[PDB]
Amino acid sequence: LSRFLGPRYRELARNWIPTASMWGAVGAVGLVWATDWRLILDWVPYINGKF
Amino acid sequence: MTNIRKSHPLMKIINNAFIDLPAPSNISSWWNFGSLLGICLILQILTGLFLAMHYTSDTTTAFSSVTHICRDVNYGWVIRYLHANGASMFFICLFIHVGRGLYYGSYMFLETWNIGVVLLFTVMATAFMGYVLPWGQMSFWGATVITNLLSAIPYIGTDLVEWIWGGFSVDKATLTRFFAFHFILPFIITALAAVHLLFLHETGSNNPTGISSDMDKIPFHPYYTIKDILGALFMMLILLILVLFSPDLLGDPDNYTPANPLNTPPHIKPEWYFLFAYAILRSIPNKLGGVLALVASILILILMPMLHTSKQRSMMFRPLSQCLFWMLVADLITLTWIGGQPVEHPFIIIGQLASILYFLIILVLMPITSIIENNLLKW
Amino acid sequence: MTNIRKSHPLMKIINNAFIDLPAPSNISSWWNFGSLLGICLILQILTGLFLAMHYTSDTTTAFSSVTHICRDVNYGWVIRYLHANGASMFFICLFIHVGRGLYYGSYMFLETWNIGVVLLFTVMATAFMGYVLPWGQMSFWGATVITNLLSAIPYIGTDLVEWIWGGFSVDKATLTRFFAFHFILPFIITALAAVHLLFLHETGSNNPTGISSDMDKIPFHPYYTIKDILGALFMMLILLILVLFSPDLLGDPDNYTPANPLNTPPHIKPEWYFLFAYAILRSIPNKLGGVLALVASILILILMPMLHTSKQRSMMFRPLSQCLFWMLVADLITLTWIGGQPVEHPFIIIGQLASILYFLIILVLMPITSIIENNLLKW
Amino acid sequence: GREFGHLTRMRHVITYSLSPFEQRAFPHYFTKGIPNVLRRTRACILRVAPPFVVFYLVYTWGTQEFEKSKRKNPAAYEN
Amino acid sequence: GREFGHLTRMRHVITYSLSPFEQRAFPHYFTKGIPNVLRRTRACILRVAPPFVVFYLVYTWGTQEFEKSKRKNPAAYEN
Amino acid sequence: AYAAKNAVSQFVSSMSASADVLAMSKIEIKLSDIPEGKNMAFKWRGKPLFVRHRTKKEIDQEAAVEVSQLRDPQHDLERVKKPEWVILIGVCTHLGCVPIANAGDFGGYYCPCHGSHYDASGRIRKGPAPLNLEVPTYEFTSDDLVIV
Amino acid sequence: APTLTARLYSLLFRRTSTFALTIAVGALFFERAFDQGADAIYEHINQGKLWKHIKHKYEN
Amino acid sequence: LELHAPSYPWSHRGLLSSLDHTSIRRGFQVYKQVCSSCHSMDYVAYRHLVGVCYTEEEAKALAEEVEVQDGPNEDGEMFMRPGKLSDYFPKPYPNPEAARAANNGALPPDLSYIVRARHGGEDYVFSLLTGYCEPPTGVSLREGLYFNPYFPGQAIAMAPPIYNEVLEFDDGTPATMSQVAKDVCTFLRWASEPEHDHRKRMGLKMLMMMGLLLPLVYAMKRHKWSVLKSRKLAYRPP
Amino acid sequence: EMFMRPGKLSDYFPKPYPNPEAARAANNGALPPDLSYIVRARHGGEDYVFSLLTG
């Protein structure tokens, strides 16, 4: 994978890191909401009113 | 470089089937039901699977297992009544789809029409055995009557009936046979539906005008994906109404008593989607004649493409043919209503007349009327 | 005019799949097993279906129903032992197929190889759930151990294992869930096998030489249909030998006692086609480490294509790689034997060494040996 | 097979369109739909309704006749 | 895509065949088959067998060692 | 997303423990039905549950066990609430086999699958078992009744 | 003077990742609020009939 | 000829109306004190009352009030146990033949699904219980049969089970025949459909969600199809 | 009321005890195993049964 070791690829990673972080946040929020984890949802102000 | 959606094999199949498929732009809401059928099928599998995780096909535990599903399993009632009413929704969509095919001359797709007839028979068998599964009074006695119909076959009727029964009558053997067959058949239905779409995509879809629409084709995805999603949402609304406000509307109360081989229920009738055929079966006093009429009632769809005599494909431009079609639909409603009703003085004669009218309209009246329309149009 | 075989849609698919498919002229008998697998699958679908006509998935009627199949159902023992030994034949053919893929570099078909790995996982799950259906001592306790393995998953292990159990342990809920999943999964296996063949036919088939054989392609039908028929006949000979002369050769006798949750059998071990994995599972003292090693022992097939450091595809012209491959095969046999054996002084150390050798050969020794071979040929 | 590249030969047909974000989803929804719905209903009513009217008449007559048949006949008990 | 007619380019290769009804299905089955089998066996026996021979040795030792372990130890019961 | 989450959650929940299974989560054991020096096995949570009416001699010997000389340091007094009653889950810690009562060298339990030896308090004494038999949570509602 | 919808598009809907994050957060909060409101409506309609409305008379 | 039951204005016949759990409690008292002697509810357990009409301790007290046969003991013979909320409602008779022998050859049906097993449901049950009448002229009833116009055949083997002050309600409600019949029919409706209130709540939620979604998905479809529905096509031959 | 009848071919071989607890009580706490599959449920089969009986 040495082909992908270059300044252009580091620039690409810089460009797509915000998008990857946003998608990771989307995945985390979706997982917490779907599973009703309640380990994280206890901290959310209005949601923790439930249970 | 290339486009994955157009080059990858599975992506090629999916794109050519559901994404880039050229679709007529004028197809109405009556073309949604096809996709609806698929949805129903998928539902009838998913829901069905989650019923098999708790159902046990034993005469000593089948009814108790169903009560356990509807009493103890978390949201088991939701799943059970979704299954029960989804079968009725499946048959509603099937009837509407066959009506759409008859009206707009979609039967000219011979291979698609024949695979559809096979699908209809397979779905009817699956629903029959699935209804036998709960092992209530209605299930047991409807199975008894429907299977006993096969005894009318000459010289092999008794042997065939006792082979299907797995014994001398409907009993535990028959219940387990029906559970296995009911489990396995929907996957054969999915394979047949895949073949059905394969045959349909060979020539594209029809349209209300009955005229080739190659000059006006649109990508299937952006328009008909959302249109079919809206149709599925409406179907889900109707189904959820039936499952959350009248879960027992289309069922029969006598199926909530455990099967009693020594005591027939007050009335023995099948599920509503079979009643019309049942009605035809009761028109003929002869048992073999009744069975033959029942089979022909569905096999007439095979003859439908050959009976087409009009120069135009769709009925959109044939008012007399439209009147005949709506007479046929009202006749089918009459047959269903009578199949619900007992065998008494007015119902017998009305059912005989209705069956005669059904066969007359499909066989005699429609081709003659189409020829009359052709002569009126000077061709 | 045209040719119906080469024009009709379904006929087009069949002709391009099994009739006019260009196939290498030199593929040995090791290429039969693929078709054999399909045969086995179909058999398991047919035979199993006929077992589902008499089997009930209730703990109070599971073992009794199996004995009813074996004693009362006409030729029921034939079908039951056909199923039991056909699972073993399926796994023999699967292992030989994977060995053929490894030896002849068939994993260079990335999509085909990955679909094959998914198929292997699905078939293993299907067989594991099916072995629980008789509800014998071995079925219950092997299910107990294998499912309890899932409890080693951190955080969500207990909730996951209890969700799969349907309760607090293996009980009627688990039995019925497993029956439903066991019924449904082989159809998913058929769909995945169809996708597998779709991916394979995109690039044709490999040959023992490992060299592209487009110059020496022959029609598939007249040659490989009869060759696969002969292979299926030989496989059927072996399977019928197992069914009719040693039906209980590959099954532990302790599964013929009804499940006793309050008493463990003298020895607990899964079926032979899992023993090797079981062996690796017991090599790691840590529970989570053992489960991870078990999963990796089969996920390593995914890594296999990426570890191919040889300039030549097939091991036919790679004697050192052949030695390593046969060391791997002997190591797998050793792992199976150790998994059969109890956990005592010599068996623990031999199993640990065997697991280390398996992972070392697949991950370290094979690529280094391939590089050395490349150097020796001055590539 | 049948692909957008080659379905039919058409010449000298011009189609003008608008972006979905430049046009209203429901333009004149009621003021044009209601007359159009009325037109379609007027066109299709004479073709659709009469069979169902006949069915309803038959249904009512059959129900009435069955209910009358279930009723007692006085003439059977003259003596 | 993958059909007879465009798989590869081959030139100046002449192939001679025979009808299956003009030739014997088992030509020299044993006169030439048996020597050929021995050649194939000899070429592979030193690459396939040695790994399996090691397994047999390990299997025998493990079985013997397991037996010896279960055997009574006289020294343990001394005194 | 709301509708899909509700549907998927309902379908998943259908696969979890049913109402009756949860109803059978904790059981009632009448101590008067267990004679002295008898280890009774009950079907609890789908697994064997051992309730032994430990005798005075057995209580004394278990109280005399050297705590530090145990693979898992435990005390009989801290292992059980009532000295004369010991309640354990009949699942060996080694792999998960069912130990047999009064079979080991220590008079307690013996897992034959490999040979684990436990005392009358469930503490591992000999064999390959890494831990002691689990003690489920329980309380004595009355003199001769216990809920686990 | 951008409108509310223009602000929404510029901040959240323009980028698909932010669009999906907004959808997920909205799904969470909408589930909470909708469940609370629907439960309130249902309990008001059946006021005095549900067990939670009469349990106090039997709780200890 | 048969008589169809009237449509009584039950408090649960509303589109989103639930059951009166006080009526459910009174109907359960009626069941345990009147029809439990001959009728059975196999598919209803005491644990099913915990969240409906009795608290957990009250349900335990109800369960402990009736003895239940337990599994074999050490000697291998069955014994009796005070009972627990995991048990189902006791069977008045061991087998149906005993029930027929004790009720003049008529099997008292199981009441777990009775409202769901009879046409008319709770309406039919209420009309049957309160509909007992003196047989009209010309009706000759066999021995041990009673005239109920709503029962098919009008000759029912069940003697009128309820009457004024048949049982004394714990709630203090007057024990009129109509009140007892209404309460027991409400309880039997609960038994047939133990998910009645939850089903109504889910139906309300799904109605709200569909009313929210259908216009929205319709608007999405209109947004996508606006391109075609505004499309103007012109033909320009040379 | 339950009762006893002479018996017929359709009947299976009579059980010696009503329930396994009775068998254990009558056999010093040991349950006599069912012999319908005893040869097929034991390592050795008829060989094991014969050796056990005669040894």
Ligand code: HEC
């Ligand atoms: C005297 C014993 C007895 C009592 C007490 C009793 N039942 Fe019954 N019940 C019977 C018998 C016997 C039948 C069936 C008679 C027949 O089928 O001819 C029956 C039938 C019924 C039926 C109608 C079944 C049908 O097929 O139409 C209902 C409803 C019913 N019982 C409910 C109740 C309710 C509610 C109560 C409490 C008010 C009750 N029973 C009390 C003995 C009893």
Ligand code: HEM
């Ligand atoms: C086209 C597909 C199907 C149709 C039309 C269909 C139809 C039916 C019907 C009408 C019933 C009667 C339910 C009732 O009256 O309570 C039923 C029951 C049942 N079906 Fe199917 N079914 C289909 C697919 C499946 C599948 C795929 C499975 C399993 C994988 C399945 C499993 C069951 C079970 C277990 C029952 C009994 C449970 C119950 O009755 O509540 N069904 N089916």
Ligand code: HEM
């Ligand atoms: C499980 C059963 C069925 C499934 C899953 C199914 C599926 C579909 C689908 C998805 C379509 C495309 C959408 C459409 O054109 O409306 C379609 C079209 C069609 N189907 Fe079906 N169908 C089923 C039953 C039937 C039956 C019973 C018939 C006829 C008796 C039939 C005949 C046709 C025809 C002729 C078309 C083409 C319609 C046209 O192009 O105008 N199908 N089907």
Ligand code: HEM
């Ligand atoms: C790849 C496909 C399959 C595999 C590998 C497989 C494997 C197995 C195995 C190993 C058993 C244990 C038999 C024994 O221990 O005696 C079994 C039992 C069973 N299988 Fe299959 N099976 C397959 C497909 C099916 C299908 C498609 C069905 C039903 C349509 C089915 C129905 C059953 C039933 C009912 C049993 C229990 C009957 C008995 O144990 O004798 N199986 N299966």
Ligand code: HEM
């Ligand atoms: C139910 C399971 C499976 C079925 C039904 C199946 C079926 C087949 C068939 C019919 C072929 C073509 C005939 C042949 O090449 O011998 C094939 C080829 C192949 N299979 Fe599978 N297979 C299965 C599992 C697997 C597994 C577990 C793997 C690998 C881990 C795999 C990898 C491959 C590969 C690489 C080929 C192409 C080999 C070549 O062309 O030289 N398959 N399979």
Ligand code: FES
């Ligand atoms: S499994 Fe219990 S000591 Fe080995």
